[PDB]
Design a protein around this ligand. Structure first.
Ligand code: NA
Ligand code: NA
Lengths: 244, 244
């Protein structure tokens, strides 16, 4: 109806993504998996491979100390042991076991601190390709905990009047242009102490302020790609159930 | 080390879930899908079927009015039309096109209002089986928008100094004990007007206060179950790409 204007082009305006997001909550799996599986793939033929890596690193979870509470967390040491046993064989590119602390700071700051560690593990190129999911994943470690509180990847430890202990287990599988002929797998075990009662922590936002003492344990594992396009879907159903 | 106490059993304490959660972000799909696919399945043999339902209802998206802005939203009317064409054939159990409004109320209240509508569409039994994902999904419609802002399911409309228009498209596929021999599919098209500038809306939390004028369009579609355990994984890769 109106006159067709000449194109004004802002080179900073971010284009809308074309990426398809599919979340699966598999009720009552045959074998229990206590890792939140976050997958950034460009070829769905590597999904099976991604799931099988999550199945393997399930064995790298270990109980916390009694003084922390009754919780499971991904262990970097045990991760390395497990890594060796994984077939097809692959390489541990990097690993980390580091404490992160803050005092009377906003939750946003803590998220940034943790992000800084995971970005160091992933690397610039790798970080960039998964920046949205990575940020969201770390955000959902410290906030949005109410709807997550009873899920299989979060465990509540000791619960004093001044402090809440909890663990959080997330796994990233990455396969795209930045990965080439290998898929990257980055399990993360969070051991979190926060200066607030559970009731408050459950409804913590990025605006809230708190003191944190957090241990992060992670490693980056590169496994050569294996397409599964020729296998039946029964095999993927088996991988998800942990029976493959 | 310590004496084994007799069992104290609180019948209200919620048990930890065994459900496995897997999120897939498929970079650069062959065909674009603008629906956030949230799947609650107990048998992974119905995943393909779940994805194919999301592929179908992609065709039910329509542009908003020019006065709203340049956005896509799931249309209940067009949904009904599309529903007919879906094979294998199935039934539209229920549908809704309703406005929800609030004035100077917390975002939490709005979430509850929207939840009330979607719970009416799903029903008691159905709601209960997907209560965690449903709550999270609606929460993520009004909050946690920063990391979502450029994703394929959210569209930003007109952006005044007093108001922000945006649409949000989410789809629920449900198959469990409460569904029996059919899988349920519930697409939702949100057309949201909120009394805040985009910069504020992007970092809105449940604690924040705002006035909302929201149109919700949804329907419940029951499709008889079709296992895909015998088909190759190539077919699932094709369904995800929208080429199947
Ligand atoms: Na970001
Ligand atoms: Na809940």
């Amino acid at each position: 109806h109106c006159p067709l204007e000449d194109i004004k082009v802002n080179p900073w305006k971010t284009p809308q993504s074309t990426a398809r997001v599919i979340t699966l909550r598999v009720e009552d799996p045959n074998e229990i998996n206590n890792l939140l599986s976050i997958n950034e793939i460009d070829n769905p033929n590597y999904i099976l491979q991604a799931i099988m890596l999550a199945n393997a690193f399930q064995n790298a979870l270990v109980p916390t100390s009694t003084d922390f509470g009754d919780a499971l967390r991904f262990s970097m040491p045990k991760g390395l042991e497990i890594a060796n046993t994984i077939t097809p064989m692959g390489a541990v590119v990097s690993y980390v076991d580091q404490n992160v602390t803050q005092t009377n700071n906003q939750v946003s700051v803590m998220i940034n601190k943790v992000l800084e560690v995971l970005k160091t593990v992933l690397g610039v190129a790798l970080s960039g390709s998964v920046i949205d999911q990575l940020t969201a994943a770390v955000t959902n470690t410290f906030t949005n905990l109410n709807t997550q509180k009873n899920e299989a990847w979060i465990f509540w430890g000791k619960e004093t009047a001044n402090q809440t202990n909890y663990t959080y287990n997330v796994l990233f599988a990455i396969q795209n242009a930045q990965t080439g002929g290998v898929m990257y797998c980055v399990p993360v075990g969070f051991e979190i102490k926060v200066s607030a009662v559970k009731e408050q922590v459950l409804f913590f936002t990025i605006q809230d302020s708190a003191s944190y003492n957090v241990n992060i344990q992670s490693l980056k594992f590169a496994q050569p790609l294996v397409s599964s396009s020729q296998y039946p879907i029964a095999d993927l159903t088996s991988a998800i159930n942990g029976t493959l």
